Amino acid sequence: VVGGTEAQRNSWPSQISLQYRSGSSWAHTCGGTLIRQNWVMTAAHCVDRELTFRVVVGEHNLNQNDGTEQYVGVQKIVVHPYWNTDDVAAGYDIALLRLAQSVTLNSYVQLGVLPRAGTILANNSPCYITGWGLTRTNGQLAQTLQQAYLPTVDYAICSSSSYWGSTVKNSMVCAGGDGVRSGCQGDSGGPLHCLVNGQYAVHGVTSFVSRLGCNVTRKPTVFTRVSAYISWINNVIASN
Numbered sequence: 381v382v383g384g385t386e387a388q389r390n391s392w393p394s395q396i397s398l399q400y401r402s403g404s405s406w407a408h409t410c411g412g413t414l415i416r417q418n419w420v421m422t423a424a425h426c427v428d429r430e431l432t433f434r435v436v437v438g439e440h441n442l443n444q445n446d447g448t449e450q451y452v453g454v455q456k457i458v459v460h461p462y463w464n465t466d467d468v469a470a471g472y473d474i475a476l477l478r479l480a481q482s483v484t485l486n487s488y489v490q491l492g493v494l495p496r497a498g499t500i501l502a503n504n505s506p507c508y509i510t511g512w513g514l515t516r517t518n519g520q521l522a523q524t525l526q527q528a529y530l531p532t533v534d535y536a537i538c539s540s541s542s543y544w545g546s547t548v549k550n551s552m553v554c555a556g557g558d559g560v561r562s563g564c565q566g567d568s569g570g571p572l573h574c575l576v577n578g579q580y581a582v583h584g585v586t587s588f589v590s591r592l593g594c595n596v597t598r599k600p601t602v603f604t605r606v607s608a609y610i611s612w613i614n615n616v617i618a619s620n
């Protein structure tokens with residue numbers, strides 16, 4: 381997250397860190413949202429590589445013992461069947477991970493609430509992106525979870541020529557684009573949390589930013605629209 385602030389330890393308890401085995405260590409690569417005690421929602425592009433993955437729930441600082449972490453291996457991966465790694469603009473950037481164990485819930489570990497199917501936020505709806513992604517374009521990952529306030533940009537504006545044009549689809553949510561704050565590499569797969577009727581719900585799965593930079597004016601961060609996949613998610617969990 382570029383232009384973010386440090387999140388309070390218990391603000392976003394559904395946020396997880398998706399990590400891969402690297403030598404004799406683990407490295408964060410993407411975020412995710414805990415949606416069942418044994419299921420995580422992330423971006424399909426985060427699991428394109430055939431690596432060993434684990435999820436960390438109750439994580440706050442990637443480099444220090446928080447005293448709240450639960451480490452769980454990824455036992456099964458179900459990527460959306462229409463995802464194509466060489467066509468992120470087509471959408472479908474979503475995947476579900478079944479965990480080897482069911483995590484224990486507490487104030488640092490809770491399920492993410494999803495929006496009702498088909499819900500579309502009005503332009504300029506207030507949301508926060510959270511993640512440990514780069515804090516500057518071509519920078520480094522954050523040590524502590526960051527949050528940035530990114531208002532939505534509706535489809536009509538987002539798909540206009542000066543914004544994302546034909547790249548953005550109605551199956552995506554755009555947010556931000558002020559040139560100061562945004563998601564960045566390493567935030568992919570994580571949540572876009574938006575307050576609706578007094579409750580936050582996870583409306584987006586971070587998918588992509590501009591090749592010209594994370595924080596670029598009129599290139600809002602683009603997320604997979606969770607509300608376009610409610611039936612898909614329910615169907616995967618029920619058959620797995």
Ligand SMILES: [Ca+2]
Nearest residue numbers: 441444445446
């Ligand atoms: Ca930690």
Ligand SMILES: [Cl-]
Nearest residue numbers: 392393394395
């Ligand atoms: Cl949360």
